[PDB]
């Protein structure tokens, strides 16, 4: 059975050099006609082909990235490598290792993909979020409340409502970057007879900073 | 570079419907050896892409016969005869004849459901944030369909184009709607210098925007 497994540094800083490894089994890159290569995908965006290396050392590169890319292999150890110099934030992506042969019999297509390795290119330091309650304006069968989780790094944060006991009517929005930090929000919608009469709390964790915040949503008042 | 152009880039379908995605290349994908290395891949969330079709019209092993590919030269089509929930995801055409190898932008096959107007809620800055010197105004635009939507912030009646960050959910697994969150971030100083804050949602379910507002001084 064919398997491909990518590994990389996890996080690196802009201007540094990314060194990726692909280890595979179920086939050999010493086989005539065999090749192994790299494709990447930024989160929420498309697929970009990087490079492929053949059994006989013929190397094929995406010409736009020629100044940054070096593909190599170690056929004996079932490994292929990709070096990307001078990374910047736009090189943040999932990096996939893929098999493709140049013969019909060995499979001239991308049938086998690794699960991918995520590489995050950032200068950011570990930063705990601030957690803010979003209470409705002063003042109809339902009420919507929220939680804003601002300025954290790295991902992820976890967010529940009433420790998970309030699951229905919850939307948690994907994190997005504000400059070099992430921000996330979540809303919860309940019947108007539920709140403020019953307690509703946003539970937010940011493991990387050991942050755990329970934020009760309090109604606004005249003072 | 051989540019691979997919149309449409979003394709809503009902279960059981036929679906067709066009892929056009900027030059012929016929290789000198006579083969046309036009492939189609499907990618589901959290997963690597999976091969569906190779050499324009051959199904990969285990791909059901509701999938087909056709065309020639520069003009190609992927067809699904009766869409199943398992088929929802992002479809990429690809050419492997010419360096650099190139993918189309991806076409998201999504599920049709009844129109639904967004429920819009606006939230002033919290006491907590104000204490630290910032002031974010948040607007939720929840559970709408179709997915196309726009939000506009106004401060004291005039559009505010800067300081806005948006986030959009994927189509909901349970009710097939979409939601969006928009945040306008100001300094506390700026928040305290103006008064009327407005979130306006534009969506096909109304000819006029849904408007939610508040006045800071009344909070």
């Amino acid at each position: 059975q064919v398997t491909l497994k990518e590994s990389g540094p996890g996080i690196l800083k802009p201007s540094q050099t990314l060194s990726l490894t692909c280890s595979f089994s179920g086939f050999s890159l010493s086989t005539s006609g065999m090749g192994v290569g790299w494709i990447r995908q930024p989160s929420g965006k498309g697929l970009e082909w990087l490079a492929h290396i053949w059994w006989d050392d013929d190397r094929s590169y995406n010409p736009s990235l020629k100044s940054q890319l070096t593909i190599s292999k170690d056929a004996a150890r079932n490994q292929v490598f990709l070096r990307i110099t001078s990374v910047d934030t736009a090189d943040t992506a999932t990096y996939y290792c893929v098999r493709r042969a140049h013969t019909t019999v060995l499979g001239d297509w991308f049938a086998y993909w690794g699960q991918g390795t995520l590489v995050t290119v950032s200068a950011a330091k570990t930063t705990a979020p601030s957690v803010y309650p979003l209470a409705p304006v002063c003042g109809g069968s339902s009420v919507t409340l929220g939680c804003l989780v601002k300025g954290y790094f790295p991902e992820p944060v976890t967010l529940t409502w009433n420790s998970g006991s309030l699951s229905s009517g919850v939307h948690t929005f994907p994190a997005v970057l504000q400059s070099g930090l992430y921000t996330l929000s979540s809303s919860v919608t309940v019947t108007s007879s539920t709140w403020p009469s019953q307690s509703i709390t946003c539970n937010v964790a940011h493991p990387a900073s050991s942050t755990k915040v329970d934020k009760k949503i309090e109604p606004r008042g005249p003072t | 570079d051989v540019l691979m152009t997919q149309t449409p880039l979003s394709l809503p379908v009902s279960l059981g419907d036929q679906a067709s995605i066009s892929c056009r290349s900027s030059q012929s994908i016929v290789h000198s050896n006579g083969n046309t290395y036009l492939e189609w891949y499907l990618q589901k969330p959290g997963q690597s892409p999976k091969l569906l079709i190779y050499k324009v019209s051959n199904r990969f092993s285990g791909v059901p016969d509701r999938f087909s590919g056709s065309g020639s030269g520069t003009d190609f089509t992927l067809k699904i005869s009766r869409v199943e929930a398992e088929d929802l995801g992002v479809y990429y055409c690809f050419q492997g004849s010419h360096v650099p190898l190139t993918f189309g932008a991806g076409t998201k096959l999504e599920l049709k459901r009844a129109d639904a107007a967004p429920t819009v809620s606006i939230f002033p800055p919290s006491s907590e944030q104000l204490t630290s010197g910032g002031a974010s105004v948040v607007c939720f635009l929840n559970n709408f369909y179709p997915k196309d939507i726009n939000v506009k912030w106004k401060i004291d009646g005039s559009e505010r184009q800067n300081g806005v960050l948006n986030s959009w959910t994927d189509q909901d697994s349970k009710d097939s709607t979409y939601s969006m969150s928009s945040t306008l971030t100001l300094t506390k100083d700026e928040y305290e210098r103006h008064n009327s804050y407005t979130c306006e949602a534009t969506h096909k379910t109304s000819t006029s925007p849904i408007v939610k507002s508040f006045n800071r001084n009344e909070c």
Binding site: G35, W54, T103, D108 | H31, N35, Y37, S97, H98, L101
Partner: peptide, 7 residues
Amino acid sequence: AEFRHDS
């Protein structure tokens, strides 16, 4: 140039 394929 062309990507590598036999024939």
